[PDB]
Ligand binder design. Structure first.
Ligand SMILES: Nc1nc2c(ncn2[C@@H]2O[C@H](COP(=O)(O)OP(=O)(O)O)[C@@H](O)[C@H]2O)c(=O)[nH]1
Ligand SMILES: [Mg+2]
Length: 156
């Protein structure tokens, strides 16, 4: 039983992601102030588990064992902001190497990318971190992210 925290600028898809993950549903635009927390049972490689995800609105962060930091490939400011999210996990859980998974959401808005995939991969080498592009819109790559976060909780 593992508690994970989604971190990210407003509007990048933390919510659409968490909900595509937990119940295979996209919310087109969801009350943005609602920081939800969603307990679910899943099965990871199988060795199967329970995760309590805090979906943040961009202090249950003392107790958080894992972070998904999220940006939108369409929004460089969101991406630069992953670096403030970074030094928050550190001021808080307190080292240089918490379990962390870096994600660029909205990969489906490819005509509108302001952020390259090698940029994301290079921020991920900073954290030493797995890195993913997802589209929550189309549930693309969404399981992989949460399952990799789980494998860094347990590899640490
Ligand atoms: N095209 C597209 N839109 C998305 C995706 N994920 C989220 N959105 C849209 O982006 C907005 C914010 O989603 P949301 O999950 O609520 O962002 P949050 O503020 O991080 O929690 C809404 O207008 C969503 O429909 C995506 O993968 N693709
Ligand atoms: Mg939200």
């Amino acid at each position: 039983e593992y508690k994970l925290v989604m971190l990210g600028a407003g509007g990048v898809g933390k919510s659409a992601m968490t909900m595509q993950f937990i119940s295979h549903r996209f919310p087109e635009d969801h009350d943005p102030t609602i920081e939800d927390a969603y307990k679910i049972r899943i099965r990871i490689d199988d060795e199967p588990a329970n995760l309590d995800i805090l979906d943040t609105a961009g202090q249950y962060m003392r107790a958080g064992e894992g972070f998904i930091i999220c940006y939108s490939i369409t929004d460089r400011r969101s991406f630069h902001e992953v670096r403030e999210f970074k030094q928050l996990i550190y001021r808080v859980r307190r080292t240089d190497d918490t379990p962390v998974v870096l994600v660029g959401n909205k990969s489906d808005l490819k005509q509108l990318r302001q952020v390259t995939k090698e940029e994301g991969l290079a921020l991920a080498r900073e954290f030493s971190c797995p890195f993913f592009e997802t589209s929550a819109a189309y549930r693309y790559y969404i399981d992989d992210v949460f399952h990799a976060l789980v494998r860094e909780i347990r590899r640490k």
